């Protein structure tokens, strides 16, 4: 649960940067 | 539930990461 | 729980910018 969170919601996040540059 | 703190936490972490740019 | 949860995955994203940075 906790890795789930914690994964999921920094994995889009960092995504955002990625998308951002 | 999950999703409810996964949308939170998604919105504050873009302002951080832009405010630390 | 909530304030845990967003302060742990927040705080572990940060580091990605120092990290990256």
Redesign the interface.
């Known amino acids: 649960?906790?890795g789930?969170?914690?994964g999921?919601?920094?994995i889009?996040?960092?995504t955002?940067?990625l998308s951002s540059t």
């Open positions: 649960w906790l789930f969170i914690a999921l919601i920094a889009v996040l960092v955002i940067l």
